[PDB]
Amino acid sequence: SPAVKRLLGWKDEEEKWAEKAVDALVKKLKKKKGAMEELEKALSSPGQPSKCVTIPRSLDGRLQVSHRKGLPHVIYCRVWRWPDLQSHHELKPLDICEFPFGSKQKEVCINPYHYKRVESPVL
Amino acid sequence: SPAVKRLLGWKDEEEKWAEKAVDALVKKLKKKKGAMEELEKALSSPGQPSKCVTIPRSLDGRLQVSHRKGLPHVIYCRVWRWPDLQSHHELKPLDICEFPFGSKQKEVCINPYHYKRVESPVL
DNA sequence: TGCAGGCTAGCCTGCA
DNA sequence: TGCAGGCTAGCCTGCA
Ligand SMILES: [Zn+2]
Ligand SMILES: [Zn+2]
């Protein structure tokens, strides 16, 4: 799929993994009208007020891509912002963000610009 | 698990696959009392009238073991009788067999002695 | 007890 | 349209 490569370029085994992660996000957001465009116009315009780009959330919270489970919001900020993003602990959400991680909504925002990075508040 | 090796010996990538198949059959039959013993006393006594050793059946019919889907009754006769067993077509069941493959029962007999081999009736 | 990971039934897709 | 296969949410387990 060219849309996967198209969105990927706007950012080894991790190189491969992010392709397989973006391919599943594209197959997810394709089903919802005006969503893959909304994510495109959000990874290109950085400071401008963006809307929510949301995939369904699991009972667990974790999203599995290519045999690796992990948090969806962490996974996409890891691709489109900080590959060294160690955990959900290093990611607070924006007030503009309607469906954040840690809300129990059956929709979760995968938008890497809807979450600002922080210093870990543990120990 | 030693019970897996214990049952396996009563019969490359196929060598590995049959271990992973017998490990899942053992974890399945362990849960049901007097079942793993019933399968042991059936792969050793060949001609003697054996009882049913049954695992639950899927909506599909297929059993997945180590990334490979396939028919449970085919899978176990492939381990404990004919590794060249090409398909369910080459396997008719015994009249003594209470839960055969092709009955729509939420239990299916994995007993390799409850099914006699045949010549394919197709084309 | 939060975190990580393995296994697979169900679901979806592609194919002759 | 029977047959094969890939992807994963849910489930289960092990661990400090
Ligand atoms: Zn949002
Ligand atoms: Zn039987």
SS3 B84: coil
Q: Are A17 and A65 in contact (CB under 8 A)?
A: yes
Which protein residue has its CA closest to C1' of D6?
B67
Q: How far is the CA of B67 from the C1' of D6 (A)?
A: 9
Whole-angstrom distance, CA of residue A27 vs CA of residue A63: 14
Q: CA geometry: angle at A93 spanning A90 and A95, to 5°?
A: 155
Whole-angstrom distance, CA of residue A29 vs CA of residue A40: 11
Report how far apart, in Å, the C-alpha atoms of B11 and of each of A12, A100, B82, B112 are.
43, 55, 9, 11
Whole-angstrom distance, CA of residue A39 vs CA of residue B75: 46
Whole-angstrom distance, CA of residue A61 vs CA of residue A73: 10
The single-letter DSSP state of residue B54 is E
Residue whose entry in the numeric block shows the structure tokens 């080459």: B90
Q: How many residues does chain B have?
A: 123
Question: Which domain range does residue A86 map to?
Answer: 1-123
Q: B5 Cβ partners below 8 Å, 6+ apart?
A: none
| Nucleotides in C strand less than 7 A from protein CB | 3-11
CA–centroid distance, A122 to ligand 1, in Å, is 25
Q: Which of B59, B65, B70 is nearest to B106 (CA)?
A: B59
Q: How far is the CA of B70 from the C1' of D3 (A)?
A: 11
Whole-angstrom distance, CA of residue B43 vs CA of residue A29: 52
The 10 Å CB-count burial string (b at 16+, else e) for B38-59 is bbbebbeeeeeebbbbbbebee
SS3 A29: helix
Please, what is the end-to-end C-alpha distance for chain A in angstroms? 43
Binding-site residue positions of A: 52, 97, 109, 114
Please report how many Cα atoms fall inside a 13 Å half-sphere around the Cα of residue B90, on the Cβ side.
12
Q: Are B75 and B99 in contact (CB under 8 A)?
A: no
User: Looking at the 3D structure of chain A, how many domains does it have?
Assistant: 1
By the 10 Å C-beta count (0-12 exposed, 13-18 middle, 19+ buried), B16 is classed as exposed
Q: Are A55 and A110 in contact (CB under 8 A)?
A: yes
Instruction: Give the domain CATH number at B71.
Output: 3.90.520.10
Whole-angstrom distance, CA of residue A74 vs CA of residue A86: 8
Whole-angstrom distance, CA of residue A6 vs CA of residue A4: 5
Q: Tell me which method was used to determine the 3D structure.
A: X-ray
Residue A27's φ and ψ, nearest 5 degrees, are: -60, -30
Q: A54 Cβ partners below 8 Å, 6+ apart?
A: A99, A107, A108, A109, A110
Residue whose entry in the numeric block shows the structure tokens 């084309």: B123
CA–centroid distance, A123 to ligand 1, in Å, is 29
Count of C-beta atoms within a 10 Å radius of residue A118: 10
Whole-angstrom distance, CA of residue A66 vs CA of residue A17: 7
CA–centroid distance, A108 to ligand 1, in Å, is 7
Q: B107 Cβ partners below 8 Å, 6+ apart?
A: B52, B54, B55, B56, B57, B99
Measuring from the CA of residue B58 to each C1' atom, give the nucleotide at the shortest distance.
C9
**Inter-helix orientation angle A13-30/A36-43, to 10°:** 130
CA–centroid distance, A34 to ligand 2, in Å, is 54
Return the ligand number nearest the Cα of B115: 2
Measuring from the CA of residue B65 to each C1' atom, give the nucleotide at the shortest distance.
C8
By the 10 Å C-beta count (0-12 exposed, 13-18 middle, 19+ buried), A77 is classed as buried
Please report how many Cα atoms fall inside a 13 Å half-sphere around the Cα of residue B66, on the Cβ side.
14
Whole-angstrom distance, CA of residue A38 vs CA of residue B123: 54
Whole-angstrom distance, CA of residue B19 vs CA of residue B27: 12
Whole-angstrom distance, CA of residue B33 vs CA of residue A108: 44
A69 touches strand C (CB under 7 A): yes
Q: How far is the CA of A6 from the C1' of C16 (A)?
A: 34
Whole-angstrom distance, CA of residue A33 vs CA of residue A35: 6
B108: which strand partners? B55
A67 touches strand C (CB under 7 A): yes
CA–centroid distance, B19 to ligand 2, in Å, is 22
A85: which strand partners? none
